[PDB]
Amino acid sequence: MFTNVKSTIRRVDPEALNGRQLLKVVYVVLESQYQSALSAAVRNINRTNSSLAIQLTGYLIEELRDPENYANFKHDVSEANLFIASLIFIEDLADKVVEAVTPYRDNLDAAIVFPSMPQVMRLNKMGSFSMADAMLKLLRTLPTVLKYLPVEKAQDARNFMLSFQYWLGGSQENLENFLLMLTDKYVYPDLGLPDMGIWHPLSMQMFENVKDYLEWYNQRPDISEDLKDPLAPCIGLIMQRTHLVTGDDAHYVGMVQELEAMGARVICVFSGGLDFSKPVNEYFWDPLPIVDAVVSLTGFALVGRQDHPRAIESLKKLNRPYMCALPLVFHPIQVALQIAIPELDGAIEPIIALQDRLEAIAQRAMKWANLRKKPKLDKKVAITVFSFPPDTAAYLDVFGSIYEVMKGLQGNGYDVQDLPGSAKELMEAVIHDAQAQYNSPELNIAHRMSVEQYERLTPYSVRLEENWGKPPGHLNSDGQNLLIYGKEFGNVFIGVQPTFSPHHGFAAYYTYLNHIWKADAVLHFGTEFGTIPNLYYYAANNPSDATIAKRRGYASTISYLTPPAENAGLYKGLQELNELIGSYQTLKDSGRGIQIVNTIMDQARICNLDQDVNLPDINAEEMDQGQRDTIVGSVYRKLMEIESRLLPCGLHVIGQPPSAEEAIATLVNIASLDREDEGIWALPTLIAESIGRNMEEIYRNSDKGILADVELLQDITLATRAAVAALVQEQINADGRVSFVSKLAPWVKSLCDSGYPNVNEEKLKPLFEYLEFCLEQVCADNEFGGLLQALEGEYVLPGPGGDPIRNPNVLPTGKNIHALDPQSIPTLAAVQSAKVVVDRLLERQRAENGGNYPETIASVLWGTDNIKTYGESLAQIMWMVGAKPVPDALGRVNKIELVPLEELGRPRIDVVVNCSGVFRDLFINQMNLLDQAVKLAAEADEPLEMNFVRKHALEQAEEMGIGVREAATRIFSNASGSYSSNVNLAVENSSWEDESELQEMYLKRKSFAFNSDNPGMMDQNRDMFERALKTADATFQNLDSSEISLTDVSHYFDSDPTKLISTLRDDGKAPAAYIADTTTANAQVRTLSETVRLDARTKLLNPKWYEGMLSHGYEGVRELSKRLVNTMGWSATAGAVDNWVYEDANSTFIKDEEMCKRLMDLNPNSFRRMVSTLLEVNGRGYWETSDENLERLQELYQEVEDRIEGV
Structure with missing residues (x-):
């Protein structure tokens, strides 16, 4: 008691409770x-x-x-x-x-x-x-x-x-x-009870500088010397101060402990603000970075309106992998709005007990850190290839690109052994006799796996056995072992998974890369659904798929450019006709101009252009002046559509960018779009302004087939092509000496030479400044650069995915491409362009139906086109029911309202909206707006003949015994977690008896109804899906691009409800099928037929297109069979394919004994597929053709099965 104070008191009472x-x-x-x-x-x-x-x-x-x-x-x-x-x-x-x-x-x-x-x-x-x-x-x-x-x-x-x-x-x-x-x-839960810095759960005081933290960290007796070493792997975490101040931080703690138990030194920074760049810039340096990898747990933008330019400058300085995990990890709208934001920051995503999630985030961060730590000549880089031999519009020469990547790796001190002589030799090393000259093509076996090794290293082996049985099954099996396909080249391993619950072979391959070959990174090409980094090379023009990869396979999505687009051009009968027409303005001077129009109409009829222009059986002499001109103008504008279509006619090798010359066509169309956000006008607008002419009036007069305005347009186009060609030629022969040739000219020359010498030079000045910049970005070679950065463990510069031509900031490539804020669309420009398209679709549908508006339009929504157009297609569906999106104070579109009928000037059209799974995943918030808009339409106190949503809903409500709002259910997708109608799989596998099977699984799989009043519950509602589709007068989609057109991919046809609707309608009538195109300044609304023809004329049956593809050899043939298989698709879903498309395919590729043997010798597997497809479309009833043509194909299929399979 002398030395220690002791109380006599056991018990302490409050003096006065006072109702506490x-x-x-x-x-x-x-x-x-x-x-x-x-x-x-x-x-x-x-x-x-x-x-x-x-x-x-x-x-x-x-x-x-x-x-x-x-x-x-x-x-x-x-x-x-x-x-x-x-x-x-x-x-x-x-x-x-x-x-x-x-x-x-x-x-x-x-x-x-x-x-x-x-x-x-x-x-x-x-x-x-x-x-x-x-x-x-x-x-x-x-x-x-x-x-x-x-x-x-x-x-x-x-x-x-x-x-x-x-x-x-x-x-x-x-x-x-x-x-x-x-x-x-x-006890009593219902009762009251630094701006930034560093935190560790074990120090009761937070730290305000790095030395104070590291000092404390090294003085810890309960850790290894390994965690004290400055050579140790160091991982940054970012969190909100809130959770520390609250003590609701258990998952933050368990994270720090998981990183430490794996021997990571950890620096958790925090902030009460929304500028996490400040804590990053202070605490992840001292100068050098002290961190090998950042894992944000804020689930915010780095810098908050979010500011991406600053955040990007910050993360590029630090130059380390940026990973983000939403706190939700530890409803469905807030998830889709949240996850989108970190992606614009360049984030990778490493995503019942916490174990799984913590362990996942932890292990993945280590492997990203390990990419820094590990020396170049020990780093092992798996590259995985899908569907070789071939039995998206990637536009990728795969083995071309792999070769360049293997060379690039060896030019930078990775251990690449026995790098073969060419791309073909590389392919020869993986697929032995791919060409089937001598023996069967067969895949180089890189390792045989015993059932012992499989089941031991693959823990989930059993969960596949349910329906693939005992390993090794009948696929990638010798009978005892599973077979890992590929060829080791030292530290690079080029793998192949020809085929995809997934079978034991598919698991076995990823078991090899992870636990046996032990890769440090894997690289996929986006052409689907462990802990090692996952890199994809994805087309710059495919943000939507790229985004699905970021979220489904923990991916980082480096962008490559699609081949430099060429004008499709004319050929054979179509060139001949362009000549006949070119001679019509000369033979009017000769007072002869009658019999030529008869000849023009006849050649137009041979080209099958009679289906695209109304070509009445009336001799020219029996027609006035006006309507002879109008017949030519009509045929000539459709020839010019074919000639001027801008598409790629070949494949891309990664790292091999377009020359300045092959970039001119791309630049022509870049030059052909007004840009308010760049304060510049389209060169064609200025050329038309110089004649006191509105370029919108010309387009619409060109559409009408007014010959004068078709010639004027083609003239202005040729003018624009030359001007831009002059600028590119000036920059070439100024051999990169004058850094900016547009600011010193030969493009005012090649405007005057063209015959337009009053082009406002104030406006023209900055345009060609932009074009020259755009040219430089197109020609950039950053593609191999981006893969290097990723493999070094640096931060890859993020950028927008999209159309380069509509948004040049998609250039240059070599970036971790992102979609966009799902709340930033549609924009007032997209809304305004939407109305034009809708007004145009309704005008065309009345015209082909006695002047009566359609009552219901069935529409598809893709993520892809709405990313590239800032929500046009989405906005079109809004305008149909007479609704406008309402952006808030901060420019976020999160509300919608009806427009009064006064302002719409027509009745509200009813809608069936088929949203892709991908549209659902990115843009469920817009699905929410659309469903709100439709239901306001149905509830509206308007006459039923002015409001078709409400006309239909009232009727369907009574029949189904439900409320008018529940009856107004029109927004549909795949169930949560699912994608596509699977009609694409059936058609790729020729595994379907009749159209009713396709149509049946569509109704099963696509009838999941979105509900704005209960957004979490997307229940199946097949009664409503059928009753709504039942009412459809027309089907409608928006074309992505000319490169991702109707025949380039299988998704448009997979979502097509055209024949489905003709089945469900009691009156059995097929709906009119339309496809909008807004890729150029001249928005067309075509028929599905028009659009399939235009793909056939520019792609499959175009020499420029097929010879361009075949100039790449093996993988060339693959692109050909793709357009033909996707063409079959349209026969099955729409019947939208003209018989001549199939005939001409057979003519070009089969009856030409040269081309036929050429294709077979070049690629048996893809040629076999071309023959199957033509025999199938006949076999099913879509192609009528000679018994002789079918006998040839039937032999050719036997010839090539023999080559591939042996005898």
């Missing part, structure tokens, strides 16, 4: 320090806390002998909210404690036992928490316990660790916090 909640606390403890510190904390809470009072009774441990005392202890525990004990090691009395407590443990809101004998510790109860030097062991253990628990139950264990950290401190205010925290969280 009374907390009852009972302690038994060894140390008088802790007795008098608790008593002090209670008297301080009692004297100041305006809502709570605390009653405290207790005993030092040895005072529990007197039965006087032990009675009162038992009594006090009866009535007690909270029981505390610490350092109870007297076995005698430990049991006396347990006897008194365990009876009322059910009764105690909580009981906290710090290091005592294990009988007493068992009493621990803190919400869901129990037992299910001495003081620091328990502390340092508790973080290791959190992963095994669900987040609620981690939080209770974190509360016990926070309550312990308080006790150890031992301060009067530490203990006030301990009592107030236990009261807030476990």
Whole structure:
């Protein structure tokens, strides 16, 4: 007592309760320090806390002998909210404690036992928490316990660790916090109770600089020397100050512990603000970065309106992998709005107990860090190839590109052994005799896997066995072993998975890369659905798919350019006709201009242009002046559409960018679009302005077939092509000496030479400045650069995916491409362009239906076109029901309203909206707006003949016995987690008897109804889907681009409900099928037939297109069969394919004995597919052709099966 202060007082009461909640606390403890510190904390809470009072009774441990005392202890525990004990090691009395407590443990809101004998510790109860030097062991253990628990139950264990950290401190205010925290969280929950810096769960003080943190970190006795080493892997985490201040941070703690148990040094930064660049710039450096990889757990933009330009400059300085995990990891609209934001920051995404998620994020961050740590000549780089031999519009020469990547790797000190002589030699090394000259094509076996090795290393082996049976099955099997296909080239491994629950072979391949070959990175090409980094080379023009990869395969999506587009051109009968027409303005001077129009109409009829122009059977002589001109103008504008269509006619090799010359066509169309955001006008607008001419009036007069305006347009086009060619030629022969040739000219010459010498040079000045910049970005070679950065463990510059021509900022390529803020669309320009398209679709549908508006239009929505047009197609569906999106103060589109009928000037058209799975994934927020818009239309107090949504909904509501709003259900997709109608799979696998099977699985798979009134529940609603489709007068889609057109991919046809609707309608009528194209300044709304023809004329049956593709050899043939297989698709879904398309395909590729043998010799597998397709479209009833043509194909299929399979 001389040396240690001891109270005579056991019990502390509040003087006056004053209607406060009374907390009852009972302690038994060894140390008088802790007795008098608790008593002090209670008297301080009692004297100041305006809502709570605390009653405290207790005993030092040895005072529990007197039965006087032990009675009162038992009594006090009866009535007690909270029981505390610490350092109870007297076995005698430990049991006396347990006897008194365990009876009322059910009764105690909580009981906290710090290091005592294990009988007493068992009493621990803190919400869901129990037992299910001495003081620091328990502390340092508790973080290791959190992963095994669900987040609620981690939080209770974190509360016990926070309550312990308080006790150890031992301060009067530490203990006030301990009592107030236990009261807030476990006793009376309904009751009140630095701007940035560094945090670690184990230091009770936060740090405000790096040295203070590292100082503390190295002085820790409970870690390895490995974590102290500056050579150690260091991983940055970012979090909101909120969760630290709150103590709701268990998942933050379990993360830090997981990174440490794997021997990562960890730097958690925080901020109460929304500029996480400040903490990043301060604490992830000192100058050099001190971090190998960042994992943001903010689930925000780095810099918040979000500011991406600053965040990008910040993350490029640090130059490390940026990973982000949404806190939600630890509804469906807020998830799709959230995940989108970090993607614009260049984030990779490493995404019941916490274990899975923590372990996943952890392991993936290590592998990204390990990309820095590991030396170049030890790094192992798997490259995986899909569907070789071939039985998206990637536009990728795969083996071409792999070769360039293997060379690039060897030019940069990776261990590439025995790099073959060419792209073909590389292919020869993976697919032995791919060409089937001598023997069967067969795949180089890179390793045989015994069932022993498979099942041991692949833990999920059994979960595949359900329907693929016992390993190794019949696929990628010799009979005993599974077969890993590829060829090792030292530290590079070029793999092949020809085929895809996935079978044992598919698992086995990824088991080899991960656990046996042990790759440090894998590189895929986007042409689908472990811990190693996952790199995709994805087309710059495919943000939507790229985005699905970022979210489904933990991916980083480096962009490559699609081949430099060429004008499709004319050929054979179409060139001949362009000549006849070119001679019509000369033979009008000769007063002869009658019999030529008869000849023009005849050649137009041979080209089958009679289906695209109304070509009445009337001799020219029996027609006036006006309508002879109009017949030519008509045929000539459709010839010019074919000639001027801008598409790629070949494949891309990664790292081999277009020359300045092959970039001119691309630049022509770049030059042909007004840009308000760049304050410049389209060269064609200026050329038309120079003649006092509105370029919109010309387009619409060209559409009408007014010959004068067709010639004017073609003239202005040729003018624009030359001007831009002059600029490109000037920059060539100024051999990169004058850095910007547009600011010194030969393009005012080649405008005057063209015959337009009044082109406002003020406006023209900056246009050609832009074009020259655009030219430089097209020609950039950053593609191999981006893969290097990723493999070094640097941060890849993010950029927008999209159409280069409509948005040149998609250039240059070599970037981790992103979609866009789903709340930034549609824009006022997209909305305005939407109305023009809709007005045009309705005009065309009335015209071919006695002037009656359609009552219902069935439309598809893709993510892809709405990314590239800032929500046009989406906005078209809004305009149909007479609704406008309402952007808020901050420019976010998160509301919608009806437009009054006055303003719409026609009735509200009803809608069936088939949203792709991908549209659902990116833009469920727009699905929400569309469903809100439709239901306002149905509820509207408008005459039914002015509002078809409400006409239909009222009728369907009565038949179905439901409310008008529930009956107005028109927004549909795949079930949550699903994609496509699977009509693409059936048609690729020729595995379907009749159209009713296709149509059946469509109705099963696509009838999941979005509901703005319950967004989480997307239930199947096939009754409503059928009743709505039943009412459809027309089907409608928007073309992505000329490169991703109707025949280039299988998705448009997979979503096509045209024949489905003719089946469901009691009157059996096929809907009119239309396809909008807004890729050029001249928005067309074509028939599906027109559009299929235009693809046939520009792609499959175009020499420029097929010879361009065949100039790349093996993979050339693959592109040909693709357009023919996708053409079959349209026969099955629409019947939109003219018989001549199939005839001409057979003519060009089969009846030409040269071309036929050429294709077969070049690629048997793809040629076999071309023959199957033509035999199939006949076999099914879509192609009528000679018995002779079918006999040839039937032999050719036998010839090529023999070559491929042996005999």
